[PDB]
Every structure is written in structure tokens, then in C-alpha cells.
Design a protein around this nucleic acid. Sequence first.
DNA 1: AGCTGCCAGGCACCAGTG
DNA 2: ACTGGTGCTTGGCAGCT
Lengths: 754, 788
Amino acid sequence: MQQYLRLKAQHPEILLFYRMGDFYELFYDDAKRASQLLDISLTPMAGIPYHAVENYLAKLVNQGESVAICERKVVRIVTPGTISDEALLQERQDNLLAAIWQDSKGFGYATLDISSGRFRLSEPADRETMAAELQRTNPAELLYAEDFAEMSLIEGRRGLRRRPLWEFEIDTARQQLNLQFGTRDLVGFGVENAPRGLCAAGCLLQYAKDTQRTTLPHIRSITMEREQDSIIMDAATRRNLEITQNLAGGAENTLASVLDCTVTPMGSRMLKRWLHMPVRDTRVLLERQQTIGALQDFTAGLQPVLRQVGDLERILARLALRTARPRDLARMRHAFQQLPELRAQLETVDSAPVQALREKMGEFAELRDLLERAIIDTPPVLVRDGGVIASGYNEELDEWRALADGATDYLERLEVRERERTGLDTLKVGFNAVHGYYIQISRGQSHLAPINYMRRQTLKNAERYIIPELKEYEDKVLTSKGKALALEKQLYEELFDLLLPHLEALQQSASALAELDVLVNLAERAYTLNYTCPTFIDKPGIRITEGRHPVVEQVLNEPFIANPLNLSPQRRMLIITGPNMGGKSTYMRQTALIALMAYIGSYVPAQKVEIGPIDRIFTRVGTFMVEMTETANILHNATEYSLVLMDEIGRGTSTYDGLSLAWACAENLANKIKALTLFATHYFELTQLPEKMEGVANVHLDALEHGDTIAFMHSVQDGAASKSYGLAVAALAGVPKEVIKRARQKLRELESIS
Amino acid sequence: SAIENFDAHTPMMQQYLRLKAQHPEILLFYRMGDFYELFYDDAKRASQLLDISLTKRGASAGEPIPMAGIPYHAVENYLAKLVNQGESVAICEQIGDPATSKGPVERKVVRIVTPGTISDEALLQERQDNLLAAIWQDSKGFGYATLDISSGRFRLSEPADRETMAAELQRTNPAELLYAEDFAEMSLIEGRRGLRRRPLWEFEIDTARQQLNLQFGTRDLVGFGVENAPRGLCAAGCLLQYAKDTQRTTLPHIRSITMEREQDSIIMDAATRRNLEITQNLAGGAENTLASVLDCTVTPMGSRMLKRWLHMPVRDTRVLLERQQTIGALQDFTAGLQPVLRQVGDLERILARLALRTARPRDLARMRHAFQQLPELRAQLETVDSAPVQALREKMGEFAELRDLLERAIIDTPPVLVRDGGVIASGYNEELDEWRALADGATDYLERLEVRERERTGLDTLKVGFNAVHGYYIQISRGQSHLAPINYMRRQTLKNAERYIIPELKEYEDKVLTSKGKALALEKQLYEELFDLLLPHLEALQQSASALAELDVLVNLAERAYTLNYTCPTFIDKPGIRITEGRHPVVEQVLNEPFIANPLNLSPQRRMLIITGPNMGGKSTYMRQTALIALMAYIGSYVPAQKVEIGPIDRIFTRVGFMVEMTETANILHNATEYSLVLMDEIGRGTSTYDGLSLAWACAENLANKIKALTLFATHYFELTQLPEKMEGVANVHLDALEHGDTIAFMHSVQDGAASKSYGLAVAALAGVPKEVIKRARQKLRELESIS
DNA sequence: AGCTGCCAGGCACCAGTG
DNA sequence: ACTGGTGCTTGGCAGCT
Ligand SMILES: Nc1ncnc2c1ncn2[C@@H]1O[C@H](COP(=O)(O)OP(=O)(O)O)[C@@H](O)[C@H]1O
Ligand SMILES: [Mg+2]
Ligand SMILES: [Mg+2]
């Protein structure tokens, strides 16, 4: 097998699937890492059935592996960040290619969604921001330069691709980007003066082009994301708020699981982007809010229609790549068929933004008519075997098919003719590749076949024959079909030519449809779930009347207790005592979720919310070392525009050390940072803080002891807690009574020394 | 819905539905000629689970029957798929002869493949036990039994309480758990794999006794020491009935049952087992466990046995001394024994297939190879002047006659299956050889006919061949075919060739296949006969496998003791643990840098240590290594230290710190004794400042003053360092830290007394907390420190 | 060596003479 | 009632390129 080895060197950095019979087999080291990744056997060979290759490619690509397919020669390659095939993508998840690099002055970063064409670049100000952007974008494939210093940022990520330094040269990048966009300069994209970011994007685009060996006309724009444009959230915060991912790695019981009832896969993906990137510009937010409210009574009629539009976004990508398959065009046609009904439904909505989306939507009556005439109602997966072009679309095509059916109908008549004559009831005409057409007779009647029948194939219970008259029409059939097939294929390629001119307008439509899906959805959720429109004030503050945790309230089959919150420049930090038992943490997390939601443009779970600008949200909620590292992050980065949620810091070390640290953090947060803060603590001593500094107050939760248990109330009230419940809980758990009695005596002694 | 009364169904479905009625909840593979088929819901389910095509069988009565199936020769690959997903599958075979059957041939379920009853090499993992268990509860308590179908090891027990029961489940980790329908503590059981709810009557004591006595050939179970344990017998009865129901043959390798009494092993609670990382790390992997360090056995059966020992430390002083002695005596011989031991392989699992009568040709082959190693082992072992070793040598036996049999009866490298012959070697049976003669004449006869006929006809394309569908033939090209002898009878037409038969060739065919049939049948008789000659020796063979596995374990522990520098612990009469220069056996191997050895002094006068030191100071490691040294001493193995004296230990408890914390703690307080090793790691959590600490203080006090167990009590609460003053039996120790400016160095060495200070602030400075904050914390700290 | 499609052996089904 | 043809799963491989 010197053939495999000599071709493997052409692709040493990538897994190589080597076709052998009805399998692709991997050898040596590739056989290893693969068995470990797909959990297939190990014989050193490993293999997968031909009919399942796409399934296994999806898994490998999902785990960051590029794969080269040898059919001999490497005829196809898939990389985790550049796929567009529906079989390899996850319907409701974004799949991004990214590139990261470090200059002396700072970071450059860029991402690309190869299906939608969404191309973004940024220039994170420091390591912490960079880490938060990596987590937020979660790239499937990440290009980085050799000369990369901070390798801790990308070390454990899947899909790492180490690239030479010359791939990050600013002049090349500019030239390449300007050529891709068809512009002289980048001023119109607002990135002309963002060199570091441009370098990242240049390497990215070159890598994408290379993986496709194709033009990428759907990539026509790039956008710059700035720090002040969005509320910043770090990995731990993002993870702790359970936005699209729960703490156990799942997808259930998350903010998205409740907010995301969109009806198309592109709308679902767009909504998840918004949730992970709340905007600060209240201009955008106000528009989103207006829209939500104006779509309330339109929601029922809109969604079932929107649902049929489907994932026009990813189909458009295969159109741009010329890989679209018959059902892609079929689904595109179906989506076009919904446009007029959507147009009619939105006509009355009094909302300027809705009217904009409506126009942006388009109609494409011509394309619709074209696809209606060209393609049959329900085409096959592939064009390969023809049968996609409808009848009446092309005369030549209708003719060859008429000829094929005529020969076909003749052979069938031949079967009945030969049948009266011979008088053999088992006589039939069949078709096979090896022998073409033939006449079959059962073994038992075969001795009666006419003398002009030529034996060609003996079966266990039959004899197949041929005659010139059979071979005559076979020719008619085959040559006619061959031409029909060839013509369908040409007509099919011609469809791309007629569609591609309108690629730009179609991308805008899918984008508008996706946004309508998101907004129609948030409209439905607000109305259905009793949300309210938050208002914005100029200075930092959060006033919530009867707020609820938007996830907990839908899951728990027990009445959710709503709670107020009044935070302002004069009431900046609340010290929260009492049992936590999930109650404090819930109250804190819901505060962050409501802020989150306010800043995505959505309605929120409350009777009333007034909220000020927020630059970042900090949530150290839920090792003493990790807890201290996360605390350091907050004290170092938070500002007076930050929302900080602290959950009992001090646990995990000595009483005096933890109390000293918590007192110090709280004081710093209240007097230096001045961030809006919810400080949950178990230290009763911290409740004296409000008597020592302005802007701090005590609230608490309590519990109710009754019968043979304890009810941990979820109601936040003013003042310090006046009870602890550790001993009550220990008593309920069965700690012997005399132990509890001693504990009680010790507790009093410890507390009274205060 | 069509009304589907018996009479509305075809004879086929009537038979199928009656059999399926006997297996309503599991897939029924139904033998239909060359296929195993499934129907209705089984077919749809199979389609999804096996990824095969869901199709249908036509019906003259309306509703087409959902259908799916696989070729009989491929069944094993599909069973693997199913049993790996925890699916049971009943195997129905055709029992009678269609050729003398009016309607449907007799069919019967001959075996049910289930997750805890597999014995086939392809479905099992080499180094992991695969147990079937049965659990049963009462008002009083629990009954539990386990069976390893592929070794015959049959055990029973009666865990006193829930926490014990949970620890038992975790330790035995059954792959299939049979439970009684009236089971109350479902929390112990839901979430387990291969759960099997059983009707109450399968746990009836009278039937259990009757069935076990029958299986064992006894009148009572007095001799097994379980006549006394009806709670356990009920589970054992449910189990055995399951095992017999799944195998539907005799189980001669299940000749005994043993009771596991609490007093006979160190009982480790579930948390101890998880925290010690015996065979599974806290993340679920096998990397960096005690097992990954200690397990360098050379056979699979030895790997399994060693893991069983690690999980069940023995309290019997005598067994322990004998294991130590063996390890001592064999430490020189390891390099010589291991390569030889390795060639014995997994005799245990092969013996199970022998007993089940499922053993494949290469199983008998590997048995042979194992027998062949006995003499060398026996030789290597004669010199070792240690009784326990000599006792093992004897038990491994010789089986010279069986070695000869296998050497005479089967070829060097037999094929995987017996089904296509080629297994029994020549000279074993003279008739068999005679039948093969005609089967090995094919060499010359057919080549001779080809030449002869090619020459006679002058047709150069002429060839003689065989076709399974059409038989033997003479082939002439299409071009020369019109020139064939008029005497040649046409048999098979091809595109460019014509095949013919003649009387001489047909006569050859007739006999060359009648003979081939006789040769295969005779072979299978002789193969099944091998079982009858081997079976009578099963018990001694099982004793031998058991001895070889124990040897592998002891030889490995001796190698490890030498290689990793371990010493032989001694036992003392009263509870106590004295360690000189001890190390954590895993941490020291998985660390690229020196491990700091430490001592330990525990006694009835010094029975509780309050352990302080900075977070990351090595507090948790010190406790763990203690428990591990204890565990290792109590399996008979040498220990990671310079010297170790250790007293009796009944149980090891661990609490590694809400309702859970205090519930577990409560169980510790309720069940620990002066003989228990208690490890409390940072417990005591309340909703206020002193809430939690107060409970930890009262708990510590109870452990010291009422229970009096051996207790390691690691804490971050500095208040607790005051306990020794107040309480007899308590002493402070600490993991030393050195502060040199902005930083803190962890020395990882245990010192007597309390640390001079706690290091929360420095540890927090280390984590990056801003200096102005730390400075403010230090100021607050001095305020607090002035209260007293 | 790569595609197609017969065959395997159960049993029912169905159109065609009994 | 009989004859004699069809159908249906997947793995193996003949029979042709
Ligand atoms: N005695 C030892 N010798 C060398 N390293 C040690 C030793 N004990 C602990 N360590 C290292 O220090 C780390 C922290 O130990 P740990 O027992 O978890 O400390 P603690 O319980 O005080 O927080 C361990 O992961 C180990 O890597
Ligand atoms: Mg029959
Ligand atoms: Mg610890």
C-alpha cells in the first residue's frame, strides 16, 4: 500500500479517508484518533460504510477535524468551519470560521458564517475581552498565526489551524478584501482604519476561498463590532446565566428554551445571536420594542406562513456555491409562494420597521413563476437520475420523453404479443444492465420457447432470451432517455444562471424573513407570557416591579413569587442575607436576565421595569481559588455602569479571612466602582455596612417552619435576616438531637461574642 | 383496527403471536429460513435501533404486517448493537424439519440475550466484570445477589440500610438489575442501566430454596453458609430463575453460592469509593485511578480479580498474612512468571463457554495453549519455598490428558466457527478422514476431466468449474459452443459462455456433496463430543483458572511493590494507624516532581486530628492517602510508605463538603464505631456566619467523645483548632506554608499543632484580587483579631 | 477492482386449472 | 384442492465490465 502512504504525505495534517470497496478506511495514527472520536473498531485500520460517510463526516467536523476524501486522488475535503451541506450542519446552530491574531498594539479577530455570508471583525482591547469574544462566537474552526503569544486563549479549542505569518499581511488583506467586495476602499463598511482586524479577516477569507476553490459571491460585506456597542459578558457569566446552554452542557431549561419559539431555523439562529449580544443603542431597542407591540395581533396568522419559508438562508448559500439540489430549489419556490400572503398580512401593521422588513422581503414573482414551470411538484434528492424538470417547460425534452415512452409502451405490447403467440403464461419482458432488455420464461416452460429466441442468461428457475426486435427498441429507449437526462441537466444548470443575478436581493429577503421570524416570536412570547415593555433612563439604575425569573417561572410547577428591585446611584448595593437555597441566586439571576432581555429589545417578565445603561454584567453566582479569580475579574473590570451579582464570597476559607475579604469587596464595589450590585452573603456582620456607608441597604429572604419541614420563602424584604436555619435543616436531616443541642449552645456563644 | 382474533390470523402469525406473547417487552428475533425477522412494533423498533429497512409482509386479511430482518449468519453483529444499548433480545429458532411439516415448523425460543447474561467474547469487555444482580427490600432491610454468568461466581448479601445498599450497588456495578415490583427506595435504583422490574412471586423464599438446592444438588444450603439468610435467598432465587430463563440449558459452572457478611470486609460508603478514585476517576474515566497504577496484571481474569480486591478489602488476618508472604516470596520471580502467565489468557471466560456448550474452536485452542503452560509454571514455582505459593501451584493442576486430547482433536489454528468444518484435525477419527478423502480428491479429478475433455474435443476454451446455484459444469465459450458434443447436456447459459453437464460429472457432484455433508455432520458430532470429555473436569478446571488469576494478581502486586518502593504493613490489636513516610500512591505517580512523604499517628488516645493549612496545602491528599494505605494493607498488598502499623478497621466513611451534607453526616454519626475511619473534608455549612461551624463543632465532638472513631477532620474553620484544649482524644496538625513577601509557598508536609495563621488573604492575593482590596481586608482582619 | 442483482429459506399470497 | 409463479429483510459474490 505504497499508494496510500505516498498520498497521505500530501495531507499529513488532516485525516484521510481512503476508499476501499464499500468503505473508507483510515490507517495508522489516523485509524487511532478516529476510533477514539467516532468509536468505531480498531483492527492498524478503521473503516466506515460508504452509505454512512456523510453521517461520520458531520461528527468529525463537529469535533474540529478536517477530513480529506480519497476516491485514486484526494477529490474532496471538508473543514469544520467551511461546510455548507445540510447533511453536515446543525439546523439551529451557527457554524463559524474564525481567525485570531495578536499585534503589539492588540488583538485582531474575525468570524465568518460561510452559509449566510455574515462576516465580522473586531479588535478586542485586551486578553479578557478576547476570551469573552472567543466564548461568545465559539468558532468551529480557528486560524491563528505562528507568532502567537497568548496561547492560553486558544490552547484547548477544537479546530485549531496554525498559519504562517505572511497570511496576516495588511496590504494583501486590503487588496483581497477590496477585490472580494468590489470596492476601492473599505470606508463604506466602516473598517478602513481597523488594520489589526483586517489582517485577521484577510487570512480568513483566503482560507475560505482555498477550501472552496470557488467564488463566494454571497460574501459581499463586512461589519465591525465595537466594545461600546454591546453589553459585555465573560465566559463564566455567559455560562452562569444559562442563555443557550445549561450548566450540565444541555440545551433544555435555558433562556433560549423559553424565548425561542421561532418557526424557521434561520430565525432561531438569529435570536440566539441576539441573546448572546445585547445592544446598547436604545435607538435599535426602541424599534425592536415598537415592532413587538405592533405585531401582537398578527402573530397567529403570520407564523404558519413564515414556517413554510424554511431556511432560505442556507439554501441561498448552496445556490451561491452552485451546489443546490432539487429540493433546495423546490423549497425556494415554496418560500416564494408565501411572499404575497406575508405581504398582505403586514400591509396593515402600523410600524415603520415592519413596513421596511416587508419591502426588504421582496416578491420575486418571476423567479417563482420560473420555478413553478421548470421543476416538478416534488423532485428527488439528486438531479443525477433526472426526473426534475417538469413537462411543458421545454419542447425538446417533452419530445425525447415522448419517444422513450413510445418505445417503452411498445416493449410492453411486445410482451403481450409474444404471450398470445407462445401461449406461455410466465413470459414477461424485463430489463437489466448486463443484458439490457430480455424475455423471461420459467424453467418449466422454457423448453417451449420459440426457435428464434436466443438464450443469454440462465437463472435457477428461468431462462432469459433476446431477439433483434427487442434489441431494436432497447436502442430507442436508451438513447432517448440518455438525451432527456442530458437535457434536464442542462436546463438545471440554466436555472442557476437565471437565479444568481438576484442573489443580493434574495439574501436581503432571507435576512428580512429571519428578522421577522425573531420579532414575530418575541411579540408572541411577550403577549403569551405576560411581559412588559421596559423603559430606558439616562443614568444607571434598575427599578423592577414584580419581576420574575423568565425560565424558573415556566418550569417549576409551584407558584413563582415575584419580587421588586430598586437600584439607583443612591441605592447601589443590596446586602442580601437569609437562606440561599436557590432563592437568593434566583433573585440575582433574574435581575441579570431582565437586564439582558431589556437590552435585546424584548419585553420582560415584570409589571414594570425602568433600566439605565449597562456596559457589562457580572455574575459570580452559584474552589475558593476559582471563586476568588472570578471576583478579581470583577473588581478589576467593573465600572459604575456595570451590573454585579455576587453570591456569598468568603465561603471556603476561615471565618475572619472570608469576612475580611467580603467586607473589602463590598466596600470597594460600593465606594470605588459604584457598580449596581447585589451582594449575597451569609455573614451577618456585613449587615452593619449600611450604617457605615451611603448607597448600601439590607434585604433578605426568610423561611417558614411548619408541620414536619421548612418552607424556604422566595420573597425579598427590607432589612437583615434575623434567623439562621442550618440547625433546623440538620434536625430535619436526622442529626441526633443531642448534637443539635450542643450546636445550638455553641452557636449562641459564637454569635454573642459579636 | 381489524379485529385480530386467533382464527383471523395465518398459521404463521398464530405461532408468532403465541411466542411473542411469552416475550411481550423484548425484541423477538424470529427464525424464518435464512433470516431472523421481527414484526409489528418489534420491526419498527429494530429498524431504528439497527438501522435496517422497515418493510412489510402482505396479508390476505387487510392490515399489512410491519416487517424487518437480518440474515442468520450476521446475527452476532446486530446483537452487539442491541445489548450495548441495554436491549434484551429473545432468539427463536426452527426446531423441526419443514420437509415433514404440514404447516409452520415448530419454533422455540432457545436463548434470551440480555446485558447481564452475555458470555460471548465479542459482547464483553476483557478487563471488566459484567454482573447480573437482583435486589429485594423489606420492612427490615435489603436482599442482594450477584452472579457472573461467565465465571459462575454467585454471591448473596443483606445490606443493613439504604446507604449500605447504595454502596453495594456502586461496588458491584451490575449491568442488569432485577428488582421486585414492590421496591420502595426507587432512588437507589432509578437511573441504573439494564433495570428489570419483576413480579413479586419471583422472590418467594420457598421457591428460592427449592431452586437453589436443585441447582446445587443439595438438600439444604447449610453447607454454603446461606441457609440463614432468607432475605438474600429471595434475591438469589429471582436471579437464578432469570439466568436459567435466559440460557435455557444447564448451568454446571454455577455450583455454589457464598454469603458476603459485613464483618468480613471493610465497608466503604459510596463517597469513599468515589473520593478515593479506586477504579474510576471523579470525571468518570479510568485514567489516574488506583487501578491505573496498581493494575499491571497480565491476564484479563487477573485484572478483574484485582479490581474486585481493591473494592472489597478483607478483614481476615490469616488471608492477609498469606497474601503478603506470597508477594514477598515471588518478588524475585516476577520477570520469569509474567510472560508465561500471560499466555494462559482468559481461561475463566472460556471455561464458562465450555460449561454453556458455546465454546468456539479458538476457545478450545486457547485452552490448549493454556494447558501447555502449566508445566513451565509448575517448574518455575517449585523452588519458591512458601506454603501459600505451593498451595497455588497445586491448585492450578496439570490436565495432561486434556492437553493431549485437544492436541489430537483440533488443528493448530482452527477457524472462528465450527459451522463450516475444518476444525477437527486428521487422524483423530478414521471415518471422518475417509469422508474428507472424496472432499480432497477435487484436486486431481476435476483438473483431469478438464484436460481429458479439452483434448478429446479440441475446444481450447473448455474449462471445468463449480457453481453453487447450478452445480459442477463444463464450460465452453460462446464461439466454440456450437461445436460441443451432442452428448453434453446444457445446464447454464451465460453472455459469452455455455455450461454443460455429463453423467460422469453429475455422478461426481452427487457424491462430492453427499460426502461433504457426511464430513461436516460427523465433524460436528466429534466437536460436541469434546464437550462431553471436557465437562467432567469443569470443577478442577475452574479451580485452576481461579488459582492462575490469583497468581497473576499476587505476582503483579509483588512487581509493583518492588518497582514503586512499597513496604509490608503489620497489623496491631487495637484501632490505630501509624505511618512513617507515607505517600499518595496515585498522586506521586501522576506528578512530575517530588511527592512529599508524611507521617501519621492515630490511636485510641490520639483518635481525632483537626487538620488545617491553606487551600491547596495538601489537606485532602493527606486524608486520601491515609484511606488508600489502609485499603491496600487490607487487600494483602504492600504499601506506599517506609513503615506502616495498622489496627482493625470496620468501615471507612467520607464526607466531602445542604440536606445532603447533613443527611450523610447524620448517617456517619449513626453508624460509625471505635473501629471506623472517618474522613470529614471541610464540612459545616449554614445560612449564617456560625451556623455551619457550630454543627461541625458539635459533630466533631460527638465523633471524639461518643463514637470515638479514628477521624481525620480537615477544616477551614480556625475556631476548630481550639478543640484539642477542650476535648480528650483530639489533636491539631497542619500542612505547613511559608510566606515570603507577596506569595505563599506550599510545603505539603504535616506538622503538629495548629498553623500560626490561616491564609485566606494570601490565597486570595494569589488569585489576583486587587491589592487595594487585600490591603483593606488585612485592615479589617486586624480589627477582628483584636476581639480576643 | 467497481456495480448490479441473484440467491439464501422460511411462509403467505394469487391467478389458473381441478 | 393443487401448480407454479410472486414478495421480503441483508450479506456474499457471480458475472460482467
Ligand atoms: N504531599 C504532597 N506532595 C506533593 N504534592 C502534593 C502533596 N499533597 C498535595 N499535593 C499537591 O497539591 C494539590 C492540592 O492538594 P489538596 O489535598 O487538594 O489541598 P487542600 O485539600 O488543602 O485544598 C494536589 O492536587 C497535589 O497536586
Ligand atoms: Mg412444510
Ligand atoms: Mg481539599
